[PDB]
Amino acid sequence: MISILHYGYSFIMLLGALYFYLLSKDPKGVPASEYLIAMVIPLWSGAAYLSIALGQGLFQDTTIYYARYIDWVISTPLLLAALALTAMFGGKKNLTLLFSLVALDVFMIITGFVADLSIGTTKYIWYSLGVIALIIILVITFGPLRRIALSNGTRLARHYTRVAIYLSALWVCYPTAWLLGPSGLGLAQELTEVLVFIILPIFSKVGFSIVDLHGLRKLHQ
Amino acid sequence: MISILHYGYSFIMLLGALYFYLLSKDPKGVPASEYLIAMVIPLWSGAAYLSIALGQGLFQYDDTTIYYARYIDWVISTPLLLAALALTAMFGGKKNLTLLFSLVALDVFMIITGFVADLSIGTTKYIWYSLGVIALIIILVITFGPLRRIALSNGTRLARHYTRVAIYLSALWVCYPTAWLLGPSGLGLAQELTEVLVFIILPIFSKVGFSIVDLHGLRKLHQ
Amino acid sequence: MISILHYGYSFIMLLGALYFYLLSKDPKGVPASEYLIAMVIPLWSGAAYLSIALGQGLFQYDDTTIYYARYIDWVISTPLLLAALALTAMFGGKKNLTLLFSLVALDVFMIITGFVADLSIGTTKYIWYSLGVIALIIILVITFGPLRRIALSNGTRLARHYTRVAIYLSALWVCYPTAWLLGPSGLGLAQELTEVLVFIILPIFSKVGFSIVDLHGLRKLH
Ligand SMILES: CCCCCCCC/C=C/CCCCCCCC(=O)O
Ligand SMILES: CCCCCCCC/C=C/CCCCCCCC(=O)O
Ligand SMILES: CCCCCCCC/C=C/CCCCCCCC(=O)O
Numbered sequence: 001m002i003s004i005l006h007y008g009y010s011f012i013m014l015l016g017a018l019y020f021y022l023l024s025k026d027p028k029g030v031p032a033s034e035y036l037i038a039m040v041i042p043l044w045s046g047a048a049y050l051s052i053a054l055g056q057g058l059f060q061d062t063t064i065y066y067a068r069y070i071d072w073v074i075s076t077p078l079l080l081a082a083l084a085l086t087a088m089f090g091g092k093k094n095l096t097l098l099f100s101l102v103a104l105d106v107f108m109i110i111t112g113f114v115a116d117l118s119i120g121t122t123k124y125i126w127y128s129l130g131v132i133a134l135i136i137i138l139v140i141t142f143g144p145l146r147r148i149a150l151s152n153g154t155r156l157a158r159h160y161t162r163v164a165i166y167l168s169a170l171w172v173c174y175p176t177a178w179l180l181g182p183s184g185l186g187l188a189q190e191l192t193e194v195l196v197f198i199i200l201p202i203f204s205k206v207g208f209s210i211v212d213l214h215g216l217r218k219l220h221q
Numbered sequence: 222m223i224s225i226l227h228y229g230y231s232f233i234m235l236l237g238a239l240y241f242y243l244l245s246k247d248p249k250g251v252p253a254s255e256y257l258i259a260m261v262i263p264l265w266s267g268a269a270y271l272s273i274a275l276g277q278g279l280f281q282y283d284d285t286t287i288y289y290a291r292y293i294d295w296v297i298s299t300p301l302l303l304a305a306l307a308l309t310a311m312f313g314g315k316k317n318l319t320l321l322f323s324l325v326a327l328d329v330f331m332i333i334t335g336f337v338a339d340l341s342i343g344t345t346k347y348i349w350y351s352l353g354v355i356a357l358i359i360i361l362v363i364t365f366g367p368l369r370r371i372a373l374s375n376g377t378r379l380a381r382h383y384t385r386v387a388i389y390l391s392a393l394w395v396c397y398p399t400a401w402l403l404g405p406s407g408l409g410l411a412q413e414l415t416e417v418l419v420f421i422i423l424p425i426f427s428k429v430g431f432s433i434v435d436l437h438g439l440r441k442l443h444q
Numbered sequence: 445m446i447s448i449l450h451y452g453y454s455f456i457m458l459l460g461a462l463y464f465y466l467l468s469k470d471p472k473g474v475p476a477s478e479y480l481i482a483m484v485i486p487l488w489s490g491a492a493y494l495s496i497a498l499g500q501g502l503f504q505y506d507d508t509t510i511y512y513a514r515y516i517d518w519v520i521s522t523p524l525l526l527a528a529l530a531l532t533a534m535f536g537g538k539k540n541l542t543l544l545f546s547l548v549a550l551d552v553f554m555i556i557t558g559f560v561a562d563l564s565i566g567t568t569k570y571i572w573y574s575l576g577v578i579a580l581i582i583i584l585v586i587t588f589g590p591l592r593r594i595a596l597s598n599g600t601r602l603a604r605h606y607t608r609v610a611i612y613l614s615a616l617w618v619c620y621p622t623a624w625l626l627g628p629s630g631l632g633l634a635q636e637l638t639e640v641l642v643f644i645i646l647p648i649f650s651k652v653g654f655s656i657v658d659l660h661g662l663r664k665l666h
Pocket of ligand 2 (some may be wrong): 033036037040044074316317318319320322326327329330
């Protein structure tokens with residue numbers, strides 16, 4: 001069942017990537033770079049999850065799905081780039097702020113991987129450093145990044161705020177599920193966590209980019 | 222014999238790097254970036270293959286020898302070669318970094334699938350191999366499609382040089398997955414010594430040979 | 445004691461990063477990118493050294509202890525330090541990204557050769573070590589040659605600050621391969637405790653110390 005769910009995920013990612021490629025052929029004032037990012041995220045995630053379906057992307061008394069971290073270390077920084085470029089649409093780019101988000105995010109994912117390989121109190125030291133990184137990412141998202149969005153007009157700002165809330169709501173679920181599942185307190189069962197880390201990413205990757213790109217395309221008129 | 226062939230490769234890479242450095246001192250209208258790229262490719266490849274010569278860049282996976290150092294080489298050297306190809310098409314014009322990074326993304330994925338296929342057993346090997354081949358096909362479509370159209374927009378002489386280097390690169394690159402499939406990593410129709418010879422000779426033409434042809438053509442446009 | 449020293453290092457790195465963040469709030473003509481670089485270096489180094497304190501960032505190879513977390517640190521922290529040095533030379537002028545990325549390429553190779561040398565036995569160790577030393581020599585040639593000529597093209601005051609920072613960096617960097625060769629990874633003339641102390645004290649001056657001198661000088665040009 002776990003294998004079949006991962007095949008299904010990969011096929012959905014493929015369909016998402018094809019959809020974004022089609023959208024790219026009629027870009028409606030959205031730079032090609034934003035279509036490329038929207039395509040890379042699902043294709044990379046699909047390949048990582050395919051490795052799990054084939055029984056390669058995990059090792060074992062606890063089962064570590066290490067392929068998830070290989071996925072996120074590429075997919076999550078690209079999602080923050082998409083969010084940052086949304087705020088800066090039609091205005092000057094602030095690449096320093098964008099790369100600050102990339103740095104925080106990559107660190108966040110690495111701490112998660114190390115926490116998963118750690119035992120006892122050490123696990124929760126690494127987990128905590130990752131949570132602090134997420135908090136700073138959210139402060140940037142709703143603070144300085146949102147102020148850039150406002151400087152680019154009411155229509156863009158409203159779209160940015162919608163996508164920022166969408167992303168923020170989904171992202172807080174990952175460390176919550178992690179802590180409750182076998183990697184943390186073990187209150188939730190493996191099958192439950194597997195289902196969460198199938199459903200969340202579909203909304204986080206394909207769903208986010210549909211909402212993000214449709215909003216920006218609508219600003220063309 | 223396998224060790225000595227790898228030492229020989231590394232020394233040739235060093236000589237290639239030195240030649241490109243010399244060319245860089247009298248650049249003839251070619252930006253510094255393109256000389257830097259031409260130098261990094263052979264120096265990185267040389268260091269990787271040196272690790273094989275010293276018996277470090279390989280391990281035994283059951284009954285087969287995996288030359289993992291080749292993948293460490295290619296994951297850096299192949300995206301830089303595609304960058305050189307892309308910058309050739311864009312010589313005299315605006316850079317399209319989105320198209321360049323699309324090629325880099327496809328290429329890195331291609332090399333990774335190759336490494337995973339080599340570590341895989343049975344049908345799973347050929348799933349990963351197939352994803353890599355599809356990535357190569359898309360790279361070739363970009364090379365002879367949109368990238369070639371950019372070359373045309375930069376004039377007849379540049380376009381003619383681009384088309385020549387693109388064909389040279391394309392011809393050599395299709396040989397890699399062919400050799401891979403026929404050798405011990407695939408169907409095992411070819412012996413280890415045969416595969417080793419191919420993955421010594423191909424890279425010499427793919428790395429040093431390609432950059433000689435590429436840089437000489439661009440330098441000639443200056444005159 | 446080895447664990448306690450690494451905790452202390454990590455706390456100092458955190459304080460360094462906070463100081464640079466504060467400086468960034470009142471930038472005095474120094475672009476945000478240079479404050480970001482100064483913050484990432486100590487934060488990344490702090491995290492790597494924390495892994496050593498917790499007994500995770502090391503393993504026992506042959507009959508020696510490899511502190512592999514040092515290489516994870518340096519492969520990110522050292523290229524960012526060279527970027528900071530390159531941007532100092534180019535302050536008030538056109539950026540030369542080709543020269544900057546040449547330094548990054550040399551540096552990453554240098555750190556990788558060091559890691560492979562540490563994992564190597566006999567003659568092979570000194571082949572990898574030597575390739576790394578040659579990389580450092582070329583970095584120093586760039587620092588005092590073409591990079592210094594760019595600094596001169598940006599005026600006397602900038603050039604004087606650049607020269608001071610370049611000497612500061614160069615003096616500290618030559619100590620690393622020297623300590624490496626003398627310690628358990630090399631000839632084993634120096635004891636583990638001695639090497640641990642050197643690779644605690646050097647990085648404090650190399651990371652936090654360097655950025656204080658570098659940023660204060662550039663701020664003073666305002
Ligand atoms: C912590 C893991 C590794 C993360 C490394 C990330 C490196 C961060 C540094 C990037 C420098 C950003 C340069 C921005 C240039 C343009 C500046 C601007 O105009 O705003
Ligand atoms: C498989 C792993 C992939 C990792 C790398 C992915 C890179 C994706 C990022 C895209 C950056 C696009 C740069 C856009 C520059 C705009 C200017 C121009 O087009 O010339
Ligand atoms: C040893 C690992 C190597 C990895 C790093 C690869 C570096 C090669 C890339 C070169 C990019 C060239 C910089 C772009 C030129 C912009 C113009 C300029 O200001 O000079």
